Design an enzyme around this catalytic site. Structure first.
Site, mmCIF file in Angstrom:
data_model
loop_
_atom_site.group_PDB
_atom_site.id
_atom_site.type_symbol
_atom_site.label_atom_id
_atom_site.label_comp_id
_atom_site.label_asym_id
_atom_site.label_seq_id
_atom_site.Cartn_x
_atom_site.Cartn_y
_atom_site.Cartn_z
ATOM 1 N N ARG A 228 -10.786 -43.776 66.300
ATOM 2 C CA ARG A 228 -11.341 -44.126 67.640
ATOM 3 C C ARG A 228 -12.003 -43.254 68.382
ATOM 4 O O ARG A 228 -11.981 -41.877 68.150
ATOM 5 C CB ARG A 228 -10.178 -44.513 68.711
ATOM 6 C CG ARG A 228 -9.344 -45.681 68.045
ATOM 7 C CD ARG A 228 -9.949 -46.842 68.224
ATOM 8 N NE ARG A 228 -9.354 -48.157 68.035
ATOM 9 C CZ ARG A 228 -9.355 -49.178 67.098
ATOM 10 N NH1 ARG A 228 -10.021 -48.711 65.813
ATOM 11 N NH2 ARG A 228 -8.469 -50.195 66.844
ATOM 12 N N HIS A 276 -18.886 -49.040 64.182
ATOM 13 C CA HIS A 276 -17.509 -49.846 63.993
ATOM 14 C C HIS A 276 -17.476 -50.692 62.927
ATOM 15 O O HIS A 276 -16.849 -51.600 63.099
ATOM 16 C CB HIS A 276 -16.894 -50.272 65.377
ATOM 17 C CG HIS A 276 -15.596 -50.335 65.239
ATOM 18 N ND1 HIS A 276 -14.605 -50.218 66.475
ATOM 19 C CD2 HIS A 276 -14.471 -50.506 64.182
ATOM 20 C CE1 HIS A 276 -13.454 -50.149 66.283
ATOM 21 N NE2 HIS A 276 -13.276 -50.400 64.921
HETATM 22 N N1 LIG Z 1 -13.555 -49.561 61.246
HETATM 23 C C1 LIG Z 1 -12.753 -48.483 61.787
HETATM 24 O O1 LIG Z 1 -13.287 -47.635 62.200
HETATM 25 C C2 LIG Z 1 -11.236 -48.557 61.762
HETATM 26 C C3 LIG Z 1 -10.661 -49.748 60.997
HETATM 27 C C4 LIG Z 1 -9.157 -49.536 60.675
HETATM 28 C C5 LIG Z 1 -8.409 -48.595 61.427
HETATM 29 N N2 LIG Z 1 -9.117 -47.657 62.322
HETATM 30 C C6 LIG Z 1 -8.225 -46.802 62.965
HETATM 31 O O2 LIG Z 1 -7.559 -45.985 62.024
HETATM 32 C C7 LIG Z 1 -5.974 -46.008 62.634
HETATM 33 C C8 LIG Z 1 -5.231 -45.326 61.694
HETATM 34 O O3 LIG Z 1 -4.508 -46.645 61.115
HETATM 35 P P1 LIG Z 1 -3.663 -46.469 59.826
HETATM 36 O O4 LIG Z 1 -3.134 -47.891 59.458
HETATM 37 O O5 LIG Z 1 -3.442 -45.281 58.962
HETATM 38 O O6 LIG Z 1 -2.259 -46.059 61.132
HETATM 39 P P2 LIG Z 1 -0.806 -45.386 60.775
HETATM 40 O O7 LIG Z 1 -0.585 -46.121 59.205
HETATM 41 O O8 LIG Z 1 0.107 -45.850 61.989
HETATM 42 O O9 LIG Z 1 -1.183 -43.976 60.802
HETATM 43 C C9 LIG Z 1 -1.052 -43.283 61.977
HETATM 44 C C10 LIG Z 1 -0.842 -41.692 61.620
HETATM 45 O O10 LIG Z 1 -1.114 -40.901 62.778
HETATM 46 C C11 LIG Z 1 -0.385 -39.894 63.013
HETATM 47 N N3 LIG Z 1 0.060 -39.691 64.303
HETATM 48 C C12 LIG Z 1 -0.013 -40.595 65.435
HETATM 49 N N4 LIG Z 1 0.235 -39.732 66.421
HETATM 50 C C13 LIG Z 1 0.206 -38.755 66.349
HETATM 51 C C14 LIG Z 1 0.734 -37.560 67.019
HETATM 52 N N5 LIG Z 1 0.696 -37.343 68.274
HETATM 53 N N6 LIG Z 1 0.277 -36.167 66.288
HETATM 54 C C15 LIG Z 1 0.112 -36.197 64.972
HETATM 55 N N7 LIG Z 1 -0.041 -37.028 64.007
HETATM 56 C C16 LIG Z 1 -0.187 -38.522 64.825
HETATM 57 C C17 LIG Z 1 1.153 -40.457 62.360
HETATM 58 O O11 LIG Z 1 2.041 -39.721 62.039
HETATM 59 P P3 LIG Z 1 3.413 -40.063 61.539
HETATM 60 O O12 LIG Z 1 2.889 -40.245 59.973
HETATM 61 O O13 LIG Z 1 4.131 -38.901 61.640
HETATM 62 O O14 LIG Z 1 3.954 -41.340 61.995
HETATM 63 C C18 LIG Z 1 0.451 -41.253 61.097
HETATM 64 O O15 LIG Z 1 0.467 -40.312 60.032
HETATM 65 C C19 LIG Z 1 -5.812 -47.155 63.554
HETATM 66 O O16 LIG Z 1 -4.918 -46.767 64.621
HETATM 67 C C20 LIG Z 1 -7.240 -47.439 63.994
HETATM 68 O O17 LIG Z 1 -7.498 -46.821 65.300
HETATM 69 C C21 LIG Z 1 -10.306 -47.751 62.349
#
Ligand SMILES: NC(=O)c1ccc[n+]([C@@H]2O[C@H](COP(=O)([O-])OP(=O)(O)OC[C@H]3O[C@@H](n4cnc5c(N)ncnc54)[C@H](OP(=O)(O)O)[C@@H]3O)[C@@H](O)[C@H]2O)c1
Ligand SMILES: NC(=O)c1ccc[n+]([C@@H]2O[C@H](COP(=O)([O-])OP(=O)(O)OC[C@H]3O[C@@H](n4cnc5c(N)ncnc54)[C@H](OP(=O)(O)O)[C@@H]3O)[C@@H](O)[C@H]2O)c1
Lengths: 313, 313
Positions: A228, A276
């Protein structure tokens, strides 16, 4: 038998309605319009109007993206919008894993092989072989170690880069050193030649990529922001690019989107911008995930991709 | 006990001498200088002077590269240079496989993800998501299906691209359609969205990438020339780039190297140039291959990387 309401501001609503009906042939599916207060069991949404969800005792809501900061922010402003009884799901992978791998591997290798330096030399029609970089100097750090961070780490491990990840809780991936919590972030950053951001947007991560973070990276580091825009303080990044701390940055997301034309990022020499598109929502895959999840919910099987509203992701 | 003579026009001769002595501790190793007609069992060479090899009944010559067109061309001009009894070896892989994989995967993905289009849009500070390309439209053809072509095909198969290869003799790789001989080249080319050149330079392949070849590719094709410059008729490529037949070309090798500054390739918008660095000769890996091969030759074991002088590679 079930009723599903669908809302998306820009997608092809009729296509989605027909695809859902075929994937869930007992479902009655309809596009939601203002004034529709008829019954519904499931809602599939992206930037829903408050009215669509307020007061509904839905069996589940499916957000049509991987990130849910937009809906959670709306819910904080409008606490009446989603009853606490309603479980909230996001899109888990559904082809976004492979897309993030494609993007990260291509660009990590691009930098590792000094294609950015060769391009600069090409601009002056200058022929000059450059020294090889070595893997031992190219540790990759993944900020966020979730569904997408794990996939990216796995694809890069194939190429034999040293790898580390950062998250709230410890990970067990062989060959990937796991750092956890803010108390371990400075040690995590110290070796990251390439920093890949795959965090969710939460109050605890806003602005995390700032002057104090960038100064802890090794000299000549690279930034890949796939998560983000709010994670990056854009003026701090520009200062690190201008000083030579950061050799290159590839950015797919921004504090404001579309990125306004006055932003210095557009024309900055060591910045690459994509609008994006790092991992887009593919409708057919989303329909398959949602239909499978609804079936699991009906059978009382365990479901993965549920949002924890207290935690914020 | 053995005597080895070493010659390279630019490498660090003293480093090589010391590394060979440690890897083969019974060997006496020396740099070759004009006038040295003392005995030798093995010669390690790159652009050797005729005098170094002429009249020597060597047990083997090791060329310090993957390609041997330079030595075979010299031998055709100076038939006295290498006795027919002397077997000729080249460097087989020795880390060049992985280097070619790095280069090809990075750039295939770069084009597949339309990073070249996004860069053009970025130059005008223009935000615009573009349609996704699909694998079914992105068949990759590998011209040359040898040590390096097989490695590249394998790494790209990981990403689920359709794949085909072209060589003189049929290949058996699952999931890679094998085309063989000039009689099958037009059918091979017909589906190649990306054409990757990994042929050796031989009389039978000079100029093969010419106007007639390029016209058989699909519209909006990409060229990755990783092999030798003489394979490409540069003016035919420029015409295909200017007409839109070829959407992009990344070239690591040229008819003349360094590529002269007057070449239109340097400043052409859809061309990317690297200065013959796609897969470099790494000294430590070369020393290990050569020492292992000499040991196999001594034990009468089968050796792979021998050049067939009649065939030309
Ligand atoms: N086109 C784009 O650019 C695009 C497309 C898809 C997604 N995204 C972005 O990618 C993000 C990640 O997706 P995902 O499916 O991988 O999410 P996810 O599976 O929920 O992974 C989130 C990870 O971030 C870590 N995290 C959250 N809060 C934290 C903190 N305060 N300190 C340290 N680590 C923290 C979490 O730790 P834990 O493992 O310990 O819970 C987890 O490893 C989405 O939220 C979205 O914003 C971007
Ligand atoms: N940095 C650089 O840019 C760099 C570095 C290393 C190598 N190279 C180049 O890459 C080349 C390939 O190396 P390699 O080790 O993969 O060679 P290789 O193992 O000898 O492979 C050669 C392949 O080309 C095919 N071939 C030869 N003549 C042909 C013809 N007339 N028609 C159709 N196919 C033909 C052969 O077919 P068969 O399999 O039927 O024999 C074989 O598949 C070298 O010769 C060198 O020029 C470039």
């Amino acid at each position: 038998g079930m009723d599903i309401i669908f809302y998306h501001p820009t997608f092809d609503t009729q296509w989605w309605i027909e695809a859902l009906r075929k994937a869930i042939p007992q479902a009655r599916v309809r596009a939601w319009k203002s004034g529709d207060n008829d019954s519904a069991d499931y809602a599939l949404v992206w930037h829903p109007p408050v009215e669509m969800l307020a007061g509904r005792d839905l069996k589940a809501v499916f957000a049509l993206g991987a990130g849910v900061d937009s809906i959670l922010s709306k819910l904080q402003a409008h606490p009446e919008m989603l009853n606490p009884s309603v479980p909230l799901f996001r899109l888990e992978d559904t082809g976004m894993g492979e897309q993030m791998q494609e993007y990260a591997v291509s660009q990590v290798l691009h930098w590792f092989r000094r294609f950015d330096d060769y391009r600069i030399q090409q601009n002056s029609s200058h022929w000059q072989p450059l020294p090889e970089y070595h893997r031992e100097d190219f540790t990759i750090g993944i900020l966020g170690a979730g569904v997408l961070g794990s996939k990216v780490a796995q694809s890069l491990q194939t190429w034999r880069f040293p790898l580390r990840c950062w998250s709230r809780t410890r990970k067990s991936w062989p060959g990937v050193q796991s750092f956890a919590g803010r108390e371990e972030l400075s040690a995590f950053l110290s070796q990251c030649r390439v920093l890949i951001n795959l965090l969710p947007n939460t109050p605890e991560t806003v602005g995390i990529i700032n002057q104090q973070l960038l100064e802890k990276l090794p000299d000549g580091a690279y930034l890949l922001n796939l998560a983000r825009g709010v994670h990056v303080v854009e003026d701090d990044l520009l200062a690190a690019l201008d000083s030579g701390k950061v050799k290159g940055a590839m950015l797919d997301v921004f504090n404001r989107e579309p990125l306004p034309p006055e932003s210095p990022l557009w024309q900055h020499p060591r910045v690459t911008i994509t609008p994006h598109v790092a991992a887009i929502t593919r409708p057919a895959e989303a329909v398959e995930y949602i239909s499978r999840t609804i079936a699991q919910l009906e059978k009382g099987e365990k479901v993965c991709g549920q949002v924890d509203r207290a935690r914020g992701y």
